[PDB]
């Protein structure tokens, strides 16, 4: 078994001709299956790209009469390219120099353009043929471009026909013979029958009834609902303040009602340190933030490693302490140009002495003459009686370890309470009664939204059930409560007479009253076991062949078809009872 991008079985491919008596621009969705039926070498290559007009980069794979040419350049392709392609080819990064069934598969993953292929002899006139043949790896090109469209390159003066299909992520069950070749496959998501084949891990199914999987619905739309925020967050009086605080009397600032679009700092501010706890830096753009605070101070360069959870040292013991469970980011940058003076800058201060370590987010500003030993000080500052604070000497000619650094600590909460910061992301309309992917204040999921009678108190945003999953939400725009429901529900079973006998099957939907069915067909029959589709109902009563349930059984009878009936319990005979009448046996039987 393997899960990958395959062409689904029995799909619907597009067909193109070159018949005297077609080279359009096509999409390249997730990879292409390309088949070609030829006798005279008409199909000569392809061009892959996005715009194909020299503003972006394109890939040319061509077979000219003598060579195979693979180029990645900025081409001005012709509107109608052929052989008997382009005009410009300026900045080139990569360069390299019906009787036939030429099958190719094209993929584009992580900067690699992957090609598989196989050639087959055929003898036909039209229509893509039947059969099975696995393609083998051909080449893997490191091009590093964004392909979205493609166009076929043909030749001019001849009979040719080419077919295009699109790949999807599927699970397949492949079969390897004793020589190592793939001779057969099962598409595990085509049919319920195929699903039982996939589960039993065999190509043969015996007669019976099998549970397959609950009925699943895929979402159609995606929606985003963030609050109405217009202002940008104050990155300019946080990261670009003229004077910072000393680490012992560190500063704390509230932040609210602003969009957190930090891409404005890309040109503004180069950071030597930027580390986030409890969140991935790649999710910041999709989240909304609760109780945001910013802490600011200035330290020596050597001491920056101490602004982290569970650290020791004088900064982390007497000046500034982080919690063990911290959510937020630490940001630090060198500030020698701003905070160093040629004589020496003594404005910035720290605590060198404290009886005990600080608690998390506790500030100490007390200037009490520290008593080292015995013999109390009476606040006079002498032997074993020291001024508690000390200053940093910042000069332009310090070593990098001794230079000043500006530090900002951002503290926030995620996905529990109503939020007001909410990074950059555009909101859509609210759509109801459909299975839809959704994002509410950064919380993502899938399901169906309905109007709710629940009344939330003003300080709450989400509602959770016994299993702890979120089932209600206040809309951040209209302030209305909405219920969330899963869109996958209901049991399914498949009835087969045996794959040896036939491929015809019946399907039972256990939670449908006959529509949440895979196909309607005909012969829709309702039982207390559910809705049965694909079986003819008869008024007889036989012995049970295949049990369906609630007294209903099924069989494969005579033209052959699946029939569903009510099982008979046996023959009915009444005893001839009277009050003066007996029955005596006259012979016997010996039975083994």
């Amino acid at each position: 078994s393997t899960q990958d991008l395959f062409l689904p079985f029995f799909s619907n491919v597009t067909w193109f001709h070159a018949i005297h008596v077609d080279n359009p621009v096509l999409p390249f969705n997730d990879g292409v299956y390309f088949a070609s039926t030829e006798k005279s070498n008409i199909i000569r290559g392809w061009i892959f790209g996005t715009t194909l007009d020299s503003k972006t980069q394109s890939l040319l794979i061509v077979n000219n009469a003598t060579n195979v040419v693979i180029k990645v350049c900025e081409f001005q392709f012709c509107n109608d390219p052929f052989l008997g392609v382009y005009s410009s080819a300026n900045n080139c990064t990569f360069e390299y120099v019906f009787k036939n069934l030429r099958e190719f598969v094209f993929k584009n993953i992580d900067g690699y353009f992957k090609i598989y292929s196989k050639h087959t002899p055929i003898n036909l006139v039209r229509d893509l043929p039947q059969g099975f043949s696995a393609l083998e790896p051909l080449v893997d090109l490191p091009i590093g471009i964004n392909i979205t469209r493609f166009q076929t390159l043909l030749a001019l003066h001849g009979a040719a026909a080419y077919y295009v299909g699109y790949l999807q992520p599927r699970t397949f069950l492949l079969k390897y013979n004793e020589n190592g070749t793939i001779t057969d496959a099962v598409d595990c998501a085509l049919d319920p029958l195929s699903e039982t084949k996939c589960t039993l891990k065999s190509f043969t199914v015996e007669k019976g009834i099998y549970q397959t999987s609950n009925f699943r619905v895929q979402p159609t739309e995606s929606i985003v609902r963030f609050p109405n925020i217009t202002n940008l967050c104050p990155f300019g009086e946080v990261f670009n303040a003229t004077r910072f605080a000393s680490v012992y009397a560190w500063n704390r600032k509230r932040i609210s009602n602003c969009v957190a679009d930090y891409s404005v700092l890309y040109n503004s501010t180069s950071f030597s340190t930027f580390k986030c706890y409890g969140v991935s830096p790649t999710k910041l753009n999709d989240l909304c933030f609760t109780n945001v605070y910013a802490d600011s101070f200035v330290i020596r360069g050597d001491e920056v490693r101490q602004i982290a959870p569970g650290q020791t040292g004088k900064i982390a013991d007497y000046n500034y302490k982080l919690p063990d469970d911290f959510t937020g980011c630490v940001i630090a940058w060198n500030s020698n140009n701003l905070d160093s003076k040629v004589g020496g800058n003594y404005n910035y201060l720290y605590r060198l002495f404290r009886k005990s370590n600080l608690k998390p987010f506790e500030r100490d500003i007390s200037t009490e003459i520290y008593q080292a030993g015995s013999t109390p000080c009476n606040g006079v500052e002498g032997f074993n009686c020291y001024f508690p604070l000390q200053s940093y000497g910042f000069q332009p000619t310090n070593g990098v370890g001794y230079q000043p650094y500006r530090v900002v600590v951002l503290s926030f909460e995620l996905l529990h309470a109503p939020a007001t910061v909410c990074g950059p992301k555009k909101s859509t309309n609210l759509v109801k009664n459909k299975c839809v992917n959704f994002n509410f204040n950064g919380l993502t999921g899938t399901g169906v939204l309905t109007e709710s009678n629940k009344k939330f108190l003003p300080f709450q945003q989400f509602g959770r059930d016994i299993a702890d999953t979120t089932d209600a939400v206040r809309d951040p725009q209209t302030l209305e409560i909405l219920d969330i429901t899963p869109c996958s529900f209901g049991g399914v079973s498949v009835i087969t007479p045996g794959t040896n006998t036939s491929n015809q099957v019946a399907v039972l939907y256990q939670d449908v009253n006959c529509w949440r069915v895979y196909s309607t067909g005909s012969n829709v029959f309702q039982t207390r076991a559910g809705c049965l589709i694909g079986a003819e109902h008869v008024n007889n009563s036989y012995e049970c062949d295949i049990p369906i349930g609630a007294g209903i059984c099924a069989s494969y009878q005579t033209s052959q078809s699946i029939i569903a009936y009510t099982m008979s319990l046996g023959a009915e005979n009444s005893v001839a009872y009277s009050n003066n009448s007996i029955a005596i046996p006259t012979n016997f039987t010996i039975s083994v």
Binding site: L415, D483, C487, D511, A571, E572, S578
Partner: protein, 327 residues
Amino acid sequence: TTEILPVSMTKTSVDCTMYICGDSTECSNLLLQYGSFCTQLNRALTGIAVEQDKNTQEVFAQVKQIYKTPPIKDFGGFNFSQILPDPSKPSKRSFIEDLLFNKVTLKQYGDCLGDIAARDLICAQKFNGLTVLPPLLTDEMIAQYTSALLAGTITSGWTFGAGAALQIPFAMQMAYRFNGIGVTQNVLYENQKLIANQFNSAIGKIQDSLSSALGKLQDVVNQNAQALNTLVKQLSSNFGAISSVLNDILSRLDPPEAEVQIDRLITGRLQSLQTYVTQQLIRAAEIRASANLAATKMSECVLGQSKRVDFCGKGYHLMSFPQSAPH
């Protein structure tokens, strides 16, 4: 006197992916590494489910001739009206079976949408892949089987269990059974009215004691329900992860860091399913022993007269009558 026996239990099936991942595609791609375990669990559950139908078949479907009781009820003064089927109720059940069925208390997607979900326990189960399968024989078929057994015993004695039913007057059969406990026939024939009156009064006492008992049959229902609800409740365990909610982890964390948390949750939920399946196996073995005992009692107390002490009641056994009860 009355004896109560459990014969079958609830049949259940699990959608493994529905329970472990919900509708998360990433969790399903991660879970593809554990498919053998889900297939193994489902194999064990399907074995249990077919065994339940085999139990019911072995207890109730011994004889394949569906006898009918005679229209003329001349049984020497014995009145079996309380255990014979009432031909006017929708279900063709006897009066006592109707009383018994009222003493044990045992769904479309649109029916539970929104509020109703997570409040009603059955829908909470069904949104997490836990389904209950219906039995093969309905209540009406089992009632038909019991009525056939009763008609056979009161019209033909014990002959219908060895071959073809041979009719005999009911008093002469009673005299035969008196011979089988060591009492001569004339005792029955002389005391026939007293014996019939005592039998009728005793049946009345049974009836009046039921409309006022079935704990052995209610605890099976309670145990199955409690196990399914415990599985639904165990979905709020972190198992040492940041949260127990997949959607909360998938936002705020990228795939390489979300994978370790998802892996913890997957291991925990597979362990929960495994524990459920093991305890279901042990319970099914106990129900199977009980159903074998019920089949032996049906053969030896209803289809014959038993001489082994205390197998068919307290005292010298004369005859037995079966009635169907839920499970």
